[PDB]
């Protein structure tokens, strides 16, 4: 129920690892964001210096957030597509942290991965539609915005549009073709909610990686878990703690902290370190090396 038991023998990465290899822990949900794709060459939003929010004056823009709002995008779709060309990676290579989640899947521990990212790196690492909630959509597909025809286009088609700097318009009806991402101001995909109502009824561990937990309703997921579900954050910086002035969230440090753990560093390093404790380090090394080699050969 709502009893706040202490399931981890100690609020550390080693405590989480022993819990992951006990019998109580059979369903794991990952919540991930842009931090886990920065070492794949896709920059943050809010990280000072790197993050996009510091790097977008050049966009004739009245509000550094407007380039991701649906309202602004309806009026002026060009800056987004211009920004999309800048950021489009030359090669899609998922990170160690991505591959840690594919290890979760391969070992039957992955109940679901909820991602805020739209870069398709979860799928390239081998997470299937049954494993994934792309909470903010994806670049992988695109649709005519006209309610009358909503023709679908593949990333191959959208990429050439963006690289040829020509605004994507629909071959059937000449309306705008928008990548299948959830802009700020749009409604999250239905499957987000149907998964959320069911997944969080029996998750045994939350793995929060590479997200500042500042976009809603995604950030609210950490509170859907039952009160005794251990929660591990792997992130550059602590996140998800209740504001002192503002049901609340992460509790790493207070006297009544009992299940939240913050491993601070690179998501790739933190997943490397967790895998070591689990005896998966070599297993993780071969998988990343093999898949990077396969991708490097394309």
């Amino acid at each position: 129920g709502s009893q706040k038991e202490r399931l981890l023998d100690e609020l550390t990465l080693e405590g989480v690892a022993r819990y992951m290899q006990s019998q109580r822990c059979r369903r794991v949900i990952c919540l991930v964001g842009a931090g886990i794709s920065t070492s794949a060459g896709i920059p943050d939003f809010r990280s000072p210096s790197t993050g996009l929010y510091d790097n977008l004056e050049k966009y004739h823009l009245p509000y550094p957030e407007a380039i991701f709002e649906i309202s602004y995008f309806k009026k002026h779709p060009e800056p987004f597509f211009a920004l999309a060309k800048e950021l489009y990676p030359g090669q899609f290579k998922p990170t160690i942290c991505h591959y840690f989640m594919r290890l979760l899947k391969d070992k039957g521990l992955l109940l679901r991965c909820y991602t805020q990212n739209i870069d398709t790196l979860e799928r390239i690492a081998g997470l299937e539609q049954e494993d994934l909630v792309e909470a903010h959509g994806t670049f992988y597909t695109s649709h005519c915005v006209s309610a009358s025809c909503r023709h679908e286009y593949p990333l191959s088609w959208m990429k050439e549009k963006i690289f040829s700097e020509v605004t994507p318009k629909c071959e059937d009806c000449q309306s705008l073709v928008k990548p299948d991402i959830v802009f700020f101001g749009e409604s999250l995909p239905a499957r987000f909610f149907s998964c959320m109502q069911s997944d969080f009824l029996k998750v045994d561990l939350l793995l929060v990686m590479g997200t500042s937990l500042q976009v809603q309703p995604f950030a609210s997921l950490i509170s859907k878990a039952p009160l005794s579900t251990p929660r591990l954050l792997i992130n550059k910086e602590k996140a998800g703690q209740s504001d002192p002035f503002l049901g609340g969230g992460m509790d790493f440090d207070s006297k009544k902290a009992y299940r939240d753990v913050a491993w601070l560093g690179e998501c790739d390093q933190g997943c490397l370190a967790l895998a070591e404790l689990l005896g998966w380090k070599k297993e993780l090394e071969d998988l990343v090396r093999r898949e990077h080699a396969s991708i490097d050969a394309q």
Binding site: H136, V182, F184, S187, Q216, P217
Partner: peptide, 6 residues
Amino acid sequence: PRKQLA
């Protein structure tokens, strides 16, 4: 509910 910053 919709995608919103905070």
